[PDB]
């Protein structure tokens, strides 16, 4: 949960000049840091960020000593991210002329983490080095540095202007970086060295809205003698904005100057008001209104024993169709935590249901106040975990009986052979799945489940633009948002000729 990130940056003149045809490393590092800060600011995860820079004329750090530990400034200490940090990044951080050795910067960052970590339960620590490795290396303290890293349990990451045409100094720097990564973690450490181009792609989207499901304990009952302790969570649901807009007064910009209140009055010329204690409930029964006081309604309300998970019966999976699924959530049911007998019983039930190809029609009630529901629980078995998936089912009232004409036996809308061939060509050309024959596997070229919701992206973009530009119209939708919402260009390219043929074959006249 909680985390501390110490962004170490290089501001030496080595990054102030580069090929004019490509962006300079300094600008790329600034962009990456800005994107990370935006993501952290708009994702309230109680994570703290500090900023240290090496390669500047200034010198401000806890450990000064002699000539060692110089040209390093702890610009920003450990604190929650905020917009002033972004403003400081935009303007305050400026290029420097002096060079510095990033080992001293790493020492300074480690000292900062050690000093500022005490007093808080920081379960994770990270240090990211944004360096071009142009400066010379003084590897006279590698052993103690690695020992301190291991003792303090601090993670390390690197960001370089090139992915794994460089000077021999850069090659030596890469070699020492690889040695450090191998010592810290080993082979997998080679995957912790990134490039600015790679990081920009990954950090171009705001973080997703994340919530923690509440564990729901209950007992799956089959009869009055068999019971299995189970825990249910919510797997799939429509995510909403955590925070809502607050109404404020235009002039003073305060929520304390605006008051909302509801009043009741009769349909008379005077519009006299009536208190809430003289207001009763009523319902419509045909052409007249029947009073029904709330106390009487509670007296006559349907009462049930809350928190029930009972197995009404078992039915073949064919009888239950997906088109009848109701509700607004999907429940995942596992065995009770720290419970072996319950796990064995649930595994037996899941395996029996899968082998027999059947599902369980069950009655589900969240609590005493919740209305009872009838739903379907079906097994879900994977190579590593098994569980039950529960989805609500419709009542007799919810079903609607609508009659529609038959298209197969229509003498006016019957497609011709050429039309069917054109539709077949269109379907074949616009395929979104690739069939690899070697593995005989289907690969999804357009995975929808991995696309962040554009609504939150747009909201965060507009809020950030307003915060950094108080007086400016909102911008348009970002290009990458449109790109991620459209199929790959390859699919679009192959669909031109089939679409033209379908236009030619199918008349369409707007009425």
């Amino acid at each position: 949960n909680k985390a501390a990130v110490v962004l170490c940056m290089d501001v030496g003149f080595t990054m102030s000049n580069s090929i004019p045809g490509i962006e300079s490393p300094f600008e790329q590092a600034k962009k990456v840091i800005t994107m990370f800060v935006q993501r952290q600011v708009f994702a309230e995860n109680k994570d703290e960020i500090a900023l240290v820079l090496f390669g500047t004329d200034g010198t401000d750090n806890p450990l000064s000593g002699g000539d060692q530990y110089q040209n390093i400034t702890v610009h920003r200490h450990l604190m929650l991210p905020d917009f002033d940090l972004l403003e400081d990044i935009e303007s305050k951080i400026q290029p420097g002329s002096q060079q510095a050795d990033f080992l001293d910067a790493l020492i300074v960052s480690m000292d900062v983490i050690q000093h500022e970590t005490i007093g808080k339960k920081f379960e994770k620590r990270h240090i990211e080095i944004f360096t071009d490795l142009s400066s010379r290396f003084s590897k006279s303290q590698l052993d103690i540095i690695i020992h301190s890293l291991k003792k303090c349990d601090i993670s390390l990451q690197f960001f370089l202007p090139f992915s794994l045409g460089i000077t021999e100094q850069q090659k030596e720097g890469l070699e020492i970086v690889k040695m450090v990564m191998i010592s810290l973690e080993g082979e997998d450490g080679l995957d912790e060295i990134y490039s600015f181009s790679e990081s920009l792609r990954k950090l171009c989207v705001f973080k997703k809205i994340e919530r923690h499901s509440i564990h729901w304990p209950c007992r799956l009952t089959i009869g009055s003698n068999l019971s299995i302790r189970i825990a249910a969570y919510k797997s799939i649901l429509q995510e909403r904005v955590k925070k809502t807009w607050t109404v404020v007064d235009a002039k003073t910009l305060k929520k304390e100057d605006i008051q909302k209140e509801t009043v009741y009055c009769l349909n008379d010329d005077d519009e006299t008001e009536v208190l809430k204690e003289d207001i009763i409930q009523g319902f419509r029964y045909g052409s007249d209104i029947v009073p029904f006081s709330k106390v009487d309604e509670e007296q006559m309300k349907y009462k049930s024993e809350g928190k029930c998970f009972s197995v009404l019966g078992f039915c073949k999976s064919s009888q239950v169709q997906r088109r009848f699924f109701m509700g607004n959530q999907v429940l995942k049911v596992f065995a009770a935590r720290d419970d072996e007998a319950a796990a064995v019983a649930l595994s037996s039930l899941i395996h029996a249901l899968d082998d027999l190809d059947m599902v369980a029609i069950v009655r589900y009630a969240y609590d005493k106040r919740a209305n009872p529901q009838v739903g379907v629980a079906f097994p879900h078995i994977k190579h590593n975990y098994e569980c039950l998936v529960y989805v609500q089912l419709p009542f007799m009232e919810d079903l609607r009986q609508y009659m529609f004409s038959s298209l197969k036996n229509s003498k006016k809308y019957a497609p011709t052979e050429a039309q069917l061939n054109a539709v077949d060509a269109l379907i074949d050309s616009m395929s979104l799945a690739k069939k690899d024959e070697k593995t005989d596997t289907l690969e999804d070229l357009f995975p929808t489940t991995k696309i962040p919701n554009p609504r939150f992206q747009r909201l965060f973009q507009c809020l950030l633009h307003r915060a950094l530009h108080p007086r400016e119209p909102l911008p348009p939708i970002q290009q990458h948002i449109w790109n991620m919402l459209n199929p790959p260009a390859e699919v679009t390219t192959k669909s031109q000729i089939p679409l033209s043929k379908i236009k030619t074959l199918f008349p369409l006249i707007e009425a």
Partner: peptide
């Protein structure tokens, strides 16, 4: 296993 600057 995304962690650090990417988490």
């Amino acid at each position: 296993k995304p962690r650090g600057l990417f988490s």
